Write a protein that binds this DNA or RNA. Structure first.
Lengths: 63, 91, 102
RNA sequence: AGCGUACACGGUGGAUGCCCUGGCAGUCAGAGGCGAUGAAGGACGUGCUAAUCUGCGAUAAGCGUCGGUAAGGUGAUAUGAACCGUUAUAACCGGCGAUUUCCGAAUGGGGAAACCCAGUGUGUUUCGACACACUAUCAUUAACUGAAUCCAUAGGUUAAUGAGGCGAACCGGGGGAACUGAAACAUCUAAGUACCCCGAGGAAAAGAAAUCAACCGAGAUUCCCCCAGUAGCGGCGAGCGAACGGGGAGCAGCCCAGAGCCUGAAUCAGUGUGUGUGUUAGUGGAAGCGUCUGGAAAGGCGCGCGAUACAGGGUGACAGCCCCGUACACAAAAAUGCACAUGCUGUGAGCUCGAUGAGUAGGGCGGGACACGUGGUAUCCUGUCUGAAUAUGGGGGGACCAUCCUCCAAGGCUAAAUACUCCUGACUGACCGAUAGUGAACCAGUACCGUGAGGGAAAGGCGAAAAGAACCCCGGCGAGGGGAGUGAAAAAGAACCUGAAACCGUGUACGUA
């Protein structure tokens, strides 16, 4: 996780992170607001993963 | 056998409750209930609650002898709130 | 390095459990341990119809300090202390009294 | 009957007494400042949250890489829901790096502190919009252009230095209060005290003699001791208060003054390597069984062990032999201050000579003002100039020249000891015990007051362990109490540190119109 995604090129990382932010983050926040998803582990996992990916793509390329 | 019923920090003046209770000292519990039924004094309600709680506790704990139950001790302590205490036993 | 961890055989030195052995399942961060069938308590819990109320008094376990429990080894049958030794590529705990390895 | 006499039962308790997740005062070290690459402090968000401390900043109780640790942790308040993995990619601690909202000196402009409105270049494009950097400030340095004016100068643009303020102290200077003593008080101490600014500072200033003597001498500056609380000053009153001399920390005098000579000679600042010692997460690191009380043993007793470790702390009361720890022995992937041997650009070794600081000192010449109005009276320049010698001119000293010596235009500059802690790290207190101690031990600069600044309280102690009175009954589905149970203990009950009277009620026995 910490290093496996490091070697991925910028294009695929951008595609996957934008996919996540646009679809799955919206779905998770909607589910949380609706009262479902009794277990919040998925929320933390997805939020941390999106934070990781967005934090990247700047030091990997252009720096 | 002894039964104790007390209520702390009552929202009434100590002297009023003391003078209301003084009218009941030495009277039979069965007659005391009738006396307090029509009593218009404000402390009458609280003393009635105390005595009914006392007899209820006696029934829960004591086996019998409620009919001959007598009001043995009654007093009030200054709290101005007040603390009412009543001790009732058959003897 | 934690001298006491999950599922460790110990004997309680004090607290109405002198010489009665037990197996600690976990150790609290404050220095307390949880050994089943050692210190039984009769907790009075507030009933609640939901959340699977245990029902009346709960015969549960209370936590005890690590100081009150000493590790037990079957080699000598008596509780002793523990030291640390360097293996080929790791550090591991070992008992006393001829230095039995855990 | 009603009191009085005392006893017991309690409650209002609150005299007294014990402690602290707290303060206060000292000792040893770094720091003795930060920042336009945007200081501190505020506004607003980041938690499965109804709310808070701390952390963080739309990437937001967290991020990437490298080390130690690693089986519990996801910071807690303060529980609960839900999680991962459990011997190496859970998580924790640290070193280095990226994001790091707005206001705030607060910087594109406006503006009302957390507010609003833009431009340029770069991208991108769903050709609608969105992201990145820059856009205040004056002079100076270099460059391209450059008027009135041919050049120049000013002016226009660019890259670099200089500050957009805050912050405890002092260096030297500028100014600049009140109060008090003088029996009140004009002068004065007060007091150069309160207060503001200036240059940079962590130390600063000063730092090497026509400066003292008195005929003999120590010889750079600063701090301290005796000197000395003396001489002296003081309506010689209150009070203030020396110097010399002798000792402690310290003790570096050189340099431009210009020519030559031989010279890249020791030395200086900068600039790589290696070593050692710290910071920078940490590793290891000894020893008891039984008996009896005791809520629980660390308590009384017996026999044994190490001690370079009996410093300290926790564990139901007092522990070397329970643990954390101490001494002692070790450790750093990368950064890291300090010392050296060490690669290199420059200042840059030492000898002879005078040079000895020129319209310079002195002499001055009328003024204003230096507090100094000449009063005890001295200092700035000017209206200005003659103007020495060139350490050959002298230098001031009490029988003229005193014999004697000086030091004067060299410096510039020079480090040592020395005032202080806003804050940080380590240690200590015969300092205090919640009206003490900090105002504030408790979510205290907190409720609250105050436009802001600022001012500003009361409230600490349950139970070792919440294991917090399960349950039942009365009661109003409350409050409250009683049985039962936990708790050694509930004469420990959440209003829970021990708790006497004063004060208020009940019973007890005596006498009591």
């Amino acid at each position: 996780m910490k290093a496996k995604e490091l070697r991925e090129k910028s294009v695929e990382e951008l595609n996957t992170e934008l996919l996540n932010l646009l679809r799955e983050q919206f779905n998770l926040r909607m589910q949380a607001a609706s009262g479902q998803l009794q277990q919040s582990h998925l929320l933390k996992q997805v939020r941390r993963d999106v934070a990781r990916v967005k934090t990247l793509l700047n030091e990997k390329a252009g720096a | 056998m002894e039964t104790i019923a007390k209520h702390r920090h009552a929202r009434s003046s100590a002297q009023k409750v003391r003078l209301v209770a003084d009218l009941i000292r030495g009277k039979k519990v069965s007659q005391a209930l009738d006396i307090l039924t029509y009593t218009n004094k404000k402390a009458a309600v609280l003393v009635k609650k105390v005595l009914e709680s006392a007899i209820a506790n006696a029934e829960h704990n004591d086996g019998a002898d409620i009919d001959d139950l007598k009001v043995t001790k009654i007093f009030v302590d200054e709290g101005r709130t007040s603390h009412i205490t009543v001790v009732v036993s058959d003897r | 390095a934690a001298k006491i961890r999950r599922d460790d055989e110990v004997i309680v030195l004090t607290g109405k459990d002198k010489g009665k052995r037990g197996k600690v399942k976990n150790v609290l961060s404050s220095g307390k341990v949880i050994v089943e069938g050692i210190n039984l308590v009769k907790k009075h819990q507030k009933p609640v119809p939901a959340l699977n109320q245990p029902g009346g008094i709960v015969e549960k376990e209370a936590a005890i300090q690590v100081s009150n429990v000493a590790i037990f080894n079957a080699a000598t049958g008596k509780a002793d202390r523990v030291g640390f030794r360097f293996e080929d590529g790791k550090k591991v705990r070992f008992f006393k009294s001829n230095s039995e390895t855990i």
